Amino acid sequence: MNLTELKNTPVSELITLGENMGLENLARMRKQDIIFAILKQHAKSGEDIFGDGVLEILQDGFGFLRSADSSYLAGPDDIYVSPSQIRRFNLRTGDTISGKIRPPKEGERYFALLKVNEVNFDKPENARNKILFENLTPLHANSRLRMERGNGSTEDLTARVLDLASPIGRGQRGLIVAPPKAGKTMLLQNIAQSIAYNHPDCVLMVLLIDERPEEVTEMQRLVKGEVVASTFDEPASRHVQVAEMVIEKAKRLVEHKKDVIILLDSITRLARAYNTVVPASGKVLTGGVDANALHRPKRFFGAARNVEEGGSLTIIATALIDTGSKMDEVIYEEFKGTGNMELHLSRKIAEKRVFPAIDYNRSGTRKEELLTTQEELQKMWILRKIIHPMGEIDAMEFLINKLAMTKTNDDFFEMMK
Template identity: 55%
Template sequence: MILLVDERPEEVTEMEQCGFGEVIASTFDRPADRHVQVAEMTLERARRRVEQGEDVVIILDSITRLARAYNTTQAGSGRTLSGGLDSNSLEHPKRFLGSARKIAPTQGGGSLTIIGTALVDTGSRMDQVIFEEFKGTGNSELVLSRDLADRRVYPAIDLQGSATRKEELLLDDDSLWLSHAMRRQLAGQNPADSMMELLGVMRKTKSNRDLIDWVRN
């Protein structure tokens, strides 16, 4: 399920044409209360499917715009954070992300994974406060690099800024060793140089197994 909040209509159309999952959207010409309504309906549908034993993934673009919508629609608490953000407006977005979990098989199974994007470096103090509030709350963080994107180097990922919690539970011993070895090798480099070096190494091998052997030798 792809949830697009406060998005441009052409982006919605393009995503629908990709055929990658079900697209639910509220475009930027809709009021904030519509953004909130669509987000909550999507989450409720996902929960029902999880209760039926399904594994559901919600891709949310973006948590920043969703938090803005809640900030607009909610009654003020009387306490305003930096950037004009009401202190209560982040409560619902936090609940949204907090809905992600895996249900025990004895309770019907199913799981809900939420992948959310956050806007940074927009020049908006509100956006920065939202980002800082959610930073570090996820199980995995993938930081994109504008510098790499400007150079047309893809994937445009800031390797040093990206990480996954408890990666030892996801990787075998050899892959975990490779991850640690590459991080030590690339530490201290800027994101562009790090990615260029990693891509150069990967082009010399055909698989992760070959890459592990190449690095060890």
């Protein structure tokens, strides 16, 4: 059956299921290797397996169906996709495909997908006759995505502050500029939880690049939705692989008129990997970055856009500063001008155990009038007018005190009265 159906559960149920299948000792091999052996036996029972995965296209023309729980990486259960399907339907990268698969005969490699039964949770007829992603008409954020939870938690403020600092909507391009040891982890955590709880209609796609495996395990089983990540366990090759794969999945899902939130941390390590995997042009820039090292990062960053026809792609990629060297800062610079949504976090206030320390001054949103109603916009303008003339510490303590003294944001408006 489905691989993810065997993947949601730990290795223990896989071991007892393999014992039901009557095979060699399963616990010895890896759990994904266990799944490979188990699907091989299930196919030996004389039935066609039903598999699913997102497509990865190599130079040869065939495809691989990378699974969600395998972090969109190379695995023994990556379904081989013959080029004939790419000739008939021309399924591009990131297309979630589900269909019938057969076992690999000897001297082969993996399972082969015979016939597609589901293309991106839709009929296969829509796959061939469809308007493409880079072919769309990009626009600004029209619909507002509220962030406050509504029951008044302590980190619920961490969402409210955004709704009070700069709104966030569909199709936006958001940056999180923060130094190390500032509070980005818990911030994106409660951001994802609030998006999932208050707006369960949109597709939450949290992303993690080069962090601690404990952080990956804390992120995967805390938030709603798919959690694909690539820690330092994988080199720049697998980093760029998972990055382009999730971005193409988002492109296809927006092509199918659906909203995709991509919370990525951090963009600077992604840029480092990109600069690592670019050919040398015989010259270096300021900080130690190749010339063409920014083209593909800029493509990946600008993939986010709001569409006239349907769907949206909103990415929130965290920028890292205070690294001591120049190149990272260079990345940050090359990224302030491309994104139309900035959000800056404070470490000088975070060291004072003052959370959340968001830079209310340099935060902002372009075309933010489309992100909030009329009189709420007037009141936010007046509130920023009040926040401006006071000091940094003044504004921040006023924020934290008077918002913890409140429960929700409109209640905050009605209390400022």
